[PDB]
Write a protein that binds this ligand. Structure first.
Ligand SMILES: [K+]
Ligand SMILES: [K+]
Ligand SMILES: [Mg+2]
Ligand SMILES: [Mg+2]
Ligand SMILES: [Mg+2]
Ligand SMILES: [Mg+2]
Lengths: 180, 179
RNA sequence: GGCACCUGACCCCAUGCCGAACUCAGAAGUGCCC
RNA sequence: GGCACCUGACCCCAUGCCGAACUCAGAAGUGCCC
């Protein structure tokens, strides 16, 4: 399972984190835990062929089956208000996560005109990074293009770091193209 | 009574931060769960003493024990695939606190000649294990139902990354370590 | 409003045991998107 | 041999997605019961 971004973590990223913060044992060094990708529908468009087009492209770029999230309790009862399926969700762990981040950061994000870098301030206060991408994402597989149809998918990079400063060191050194 | 929790949140967390210098209160080690594993005594090869034993541990811990059995993978001589080898309960949150309080404010004191706890029983990742062989230390275990169960292997799992931090946690909580 | 984090379980629902997980909850907690 | 930790997985089994959980696996890994 020779993955490019994984290889970089143990080879480069891990040894330098143990320097910046000097961790006692190798198991306290922050790691990547999961990547949750959420492509919402926002009820702005209801066509059924939307959920299925998104469900299938999201599955190719992630290599995993998306789960259909749904509206729990009801809302405004006029007639045309709450559907049922409200978006797609996939949780990437292990190898599929290393492969998705390598394609996202190194081939998809760069092949975008309107891109200067990621906002280094989008950290949740507990070591996790939150991103929102409403552009076209070009992947080796297919092209994720629901720019006009749906809004932006919500990516959450959840790590084992305890603080944001250690979360971005991991991410900075990992490859994430920020602006700081 | 959840008095051991108050102690953690009022005394221990601040004393640990002082000792190790945690910048954030959520990095301070805490108890995640306690797993109890009871071997079988007379409840073994039976289904009436095994019910009085389960309800036995069920009252000691506050929750429904789980029955551990021998993996199902028979060869060619079909004679079943493993019967019950014991009971298991995973204590988290309040039930975990209440059990740790009883354990040291009731169960450990009822032991005669008690030395202390081995300060070495740390698994290397910040967790602690101990075995309470002979009972009569738990008020609940009724008479005429004592040898229904053997001794319990306890595993105190914490969020502490090392034994050092884990030990400080336990010692500040009030575990009577031999040392 | 949604996903992630955080925290809980009154409610649907859930645990070979465990609201750990799954489910649910949360204007006046944190991040991001609309 | 059991539980916990750790690491791993189409072998039974499993995930609204996810070997995260559940299941299973690991003499020559750590801890307590042996
Ligand atoms: K929770
Ligand atoms: K595991
Ligand atoms: Mg984190
Ligand atoms: Mg630990
Ligand atoms: Mg459920
Ligand atoms: Mg299963």
């Amino acid at each position: 399972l020779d993955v490019a971004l994984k290889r970089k973590y143990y080879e480069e990223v891990r040894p330098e984190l143990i320097r910046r913060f000097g961790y006692q044992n190798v198991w306290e060094v922050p790691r990547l835990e999961k990547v949750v990708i959420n492509q919402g529908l926002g009820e702005a468009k209801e066509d059924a062929r939307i959920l299925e087009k998104a469900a299938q492209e999201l599955a190719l770029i992630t290599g995993q089956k998306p789960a259909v999230t749904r509206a729990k309790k009801s809302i405004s009862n006029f007639k045309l208000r709450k559907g049922m399926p409200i978006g797609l969700r996939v949780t990437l762990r292990r190898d599929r996560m290393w492969i998705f981040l390598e394609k996202l950061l190194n081939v998809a994000l760069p092949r975008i005109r309107d891109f200067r870098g990621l906002n280094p301030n989008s950290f949740d206060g507990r070591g996790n990074y939150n991103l929102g991408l409403r552009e076209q994402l070009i992947f080796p597989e297919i092209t994720y293009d629901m720019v006009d149809a749906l809004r932006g998918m919500d990516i959450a990079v959840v790590t084992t770091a305890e603080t944001d400063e250690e979360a971005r060191a991991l991410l900075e050194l990992l490859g994430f193209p920020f602006r700081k």
